[PDB]
Amino acid sequence: SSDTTPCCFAYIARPLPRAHIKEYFYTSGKCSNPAVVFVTRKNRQVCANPEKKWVREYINSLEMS
Amino acid sequence: SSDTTPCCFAYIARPLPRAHIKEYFYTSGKCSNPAVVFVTRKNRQVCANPEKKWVREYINSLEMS
Numbered sequence: 001s002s003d004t005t006p007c008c009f010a011y012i013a014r015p016l017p018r019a020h021i022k023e024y025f026y027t028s029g030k031c032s033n034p035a036v037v038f039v040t041r042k043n044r045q046v047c048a049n050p051e052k053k054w055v056r057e058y059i060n061s062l063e064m065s
Numbered sequence: 066s067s068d069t070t071p072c073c074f075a076y077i078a079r080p081l082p083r084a085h086i087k088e089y090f091y092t093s094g095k096c097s098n099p100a101v102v103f104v105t106r107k108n109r110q111v112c113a114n115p116e117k118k119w120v121r122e123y124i125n126s127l128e129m130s
């Protein structure tokens with residue numbers, strides 16, 4: 001794209017409360033870091049590390065319904 | 066909110082209409098590519114090459130307020 005695209009340069013260090021998260025997306029593969037961005041129920045966006053167990057677990061849960 | 070950072074990975078190929086732009090900013094030094102972002106009246110964030118004459122001219126005009 002010739003528009004900006006979001007990248008993550010820090011990850012949240014501890015799990016967000018699951019119940020506060022309603023969506024996720026992956027940042028572009030063009031970014032220097034892989035990242036998951038969780039979207040909260042107050043529509044905040046939070047960067048997280050795909051390598052972490054809780055992150056993969058949250059993703060699996062979000063795809064379950 | 067958001068802890069993502071906007072980055073640019075391609076530049077618009079032709080000059081944006083000057084009339085459509087309401088401000089600019091430089092992308093973060095965290096991003097791998099240097100870029101100017103022109104923000105349009107409808108809030109597009111368009112990436113532009115800081116080396117191009119039209120980009121520098123537009124910046125200079127925005128700084129004149």
Ligand SMILES: OC[C@H]1O[C@](CO)(O[C@H]2O[C@H](CO)[C@@H](O)[C@H](O)[C@H]2O)[C@@H](O)[C@@H]1O
Nearest residue numbers: 001002003004005026027028029030074
């Ligand atoms: O139009 C969608 C998309 O394009 C950007 C470009 O970075 O993000 C994409 O990057 C990768 C391609 O490397 C794709 O996974 C994916 O479509 C996007 O993350 C971005 O402007 C836009 O989101």
